[PDB]
Amino acid sequence: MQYKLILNGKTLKGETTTEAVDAATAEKVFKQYANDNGVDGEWCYDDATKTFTVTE
Ligand SMILES: *SCC1=CC(C)(C)N(O)C1(C)C
User: Fold this and answer.
1) Residue 48 alpha carbon to ligand 1 centre in Å
2) sequence repeat ranges?
3) For residue 30, what is the domain's CATH number?
C-alpha cells in the first residue's frame, strides 16, 4: 500500500511515496530517509490519509 511523507524541514521541503506492508514499516523507511538527509523534526501520522508529516 502507498504511504506519503511530507517533509516540512528548514532546508528540505517536499513530498514522496513508497509501497510498504503496513504503516509500521513505512515509518522506518521514512525515518531512515529523513536521517540520511539530516532531518530532525516532529512526526505525525494520519491513518485516514496514510500521510507521515515531519516538521523542523
Ligand atoms: S500529530 C501533529 C498534530 C497533532 C494535532 C494536535 C492534532 N495537530 O493539530 C497537529 C497536526 C499539529
Assistant:
1) 14
2) 3-56
3) 3.10.20.10
